[PDB]
Amino acid sequence: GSAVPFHGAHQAGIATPVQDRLHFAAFDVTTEDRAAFVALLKEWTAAARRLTAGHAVGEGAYGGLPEAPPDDTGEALGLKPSRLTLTIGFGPSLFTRFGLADLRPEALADLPKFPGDNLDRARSGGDLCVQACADDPQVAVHAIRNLARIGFGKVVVRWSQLGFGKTSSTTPDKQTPRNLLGFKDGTRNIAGTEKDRLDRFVWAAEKDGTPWMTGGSYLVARRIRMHIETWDRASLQEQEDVFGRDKGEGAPVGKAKERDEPFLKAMKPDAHVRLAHPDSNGGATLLRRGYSFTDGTDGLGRLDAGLFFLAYQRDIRTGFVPVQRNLATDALNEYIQHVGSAVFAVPPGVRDADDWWGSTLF
């Protein structure tokens, strides 16, 4: 229930241990006034400093003037910080405004068309994003709601996604969670302690060509539907072939323990792990940080389940793109469909109480 520090060379919410709940919001900008937008970013940073510490925004949730609306909507009163992190990102479309064209990073790459793509343009894209992660879903909702409220007239929410439970891990010493296909998800990720690997694979460096992005990262988001009726009638052997690990322990095929190193030649040629492994993609490595979702029924008598997939990397062109290209033949494709997509440049961290979100860009 403790707080995660807000300041740092990097934004929290990436290498931070993965909290239980997600409320992810993408926003479109509705003002042409660069000065107005910069003022918003500063006001948003001030609110985030309050929210991540478990304090109400502005002058609080009650006790102000009776005839004025409260500054904070109040549904997080009496709750602890609950490990809330708030991570902001800038979408490619944003750089068509405020004269930012020349500052769009090369590594903020548009994604190519992938086979099987069925992307809903409504729940895709976005000028910017805010990833709210916490162990308490009310805490995460309260933060998005109050950010949106502060931004009224300058931003609007384009689409949002809640994740009811994590399917990722940055802490290999704790239990690996399972996704809705029933397999452990997150075993061979990057841990928040592996500072060497985070530098090599996640954080943008000054030499990469975009100086204002040093210390930031790049985010790929893909909403993925799961064909659970199809999956749930497949044999256990079929499910285990699809991934290359057994369902119970999550060990690589042939081995006894979850964390034993995979032996790729023992897996089928189209097994998910075999195709996704760094060694199959010239060393390309990802920080996976996704969450499970369910949004009611599908209107055809079934539950609607999926995986909201999030990956951070140092360069989209050397992370998500090569790996996802290698998944064209993935056995898993038979049970999933990508139905939403967006990319964001995640700026560096807020260094101290004088700093603000996006200050290196603006």
Add this chain to the structure above:
Amino acid sequence: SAVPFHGAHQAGIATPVQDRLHFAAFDVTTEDRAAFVALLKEWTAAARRLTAGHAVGEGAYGGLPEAPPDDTGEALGLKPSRLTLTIGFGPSLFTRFGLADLRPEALADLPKFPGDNLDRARSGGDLCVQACADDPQVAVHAIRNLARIGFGKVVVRWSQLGFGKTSSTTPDKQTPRNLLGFKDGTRNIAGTEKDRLDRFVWAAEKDGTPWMTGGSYLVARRIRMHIETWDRASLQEQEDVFGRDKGEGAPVGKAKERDEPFLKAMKPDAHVRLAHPDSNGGATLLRRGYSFTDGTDGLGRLDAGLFFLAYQRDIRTGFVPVQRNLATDALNEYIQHVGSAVFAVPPGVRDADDWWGSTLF
């Protein structure tokens, strides 16, 4: 922590309120009474396992490689998490299997209420399973696996995820707040109040339907909140809507949340004043609802609200008179009922040989 599955009553009504909810309504697709009773028996066997933290059937792995596993496996390595599984039967169930003359009179169709905007597709249902637990993945796994066991005899008509408090970080005697920022639950029937449960919640044999003795009647209302409008209202308007202050949740003119209200100090159309038993001939409800937030609609607005759940001994003397009295509720400016359903919740599963619905079938 686990909650015993067997008892004179079904669990999940008077038992401690868990952190999360997965509520599902099912429609029946078979006409065969025997096949349906068979399913009820299979569901009961599975619920015994699920509520103890065990996988269904012969497990989620380690069986024949050529067969699908009995359990879909996403709850492996998790704890029982106080899972309760509560089943109810909708009025439309009794048009099947020759049950028409066994529908309880207390399972009454709801009138149309002013301002209703009910989405047919998120209303009704032949039966429901209320799954409550502290871990949402435990609740979802339960619904997902019951549906799979029932595939071919029942379909999922609609489904609602909910959250209340998070127990790891919040004390138990602290009242949760709803998404309007007000404490919700202050004056409610508690599960410790055996006498009030008997008077207001549990069906008695003399009530008129013997197979429902020990059961209860459930009203579900999916209530959307107009969040963005509410958040523009002044602090005074918000407190005037309810008749309590927002910070402490004390009735107007009082000092503590649990001070008994003085109804005459509240505005004539304040929510607490219209909902109070003294304003409804003594009618009292057990509220057990959950907040929801499903995402955002096509106009950028938050799709959130209160999934209202009320248990009562007779719908005609519980939910209906109180809701009728809210016709002029000042809260009506800010909410909209968009889904509704009623269910008869049968008595408990007495022992290892009993099953869901045995008193009706």
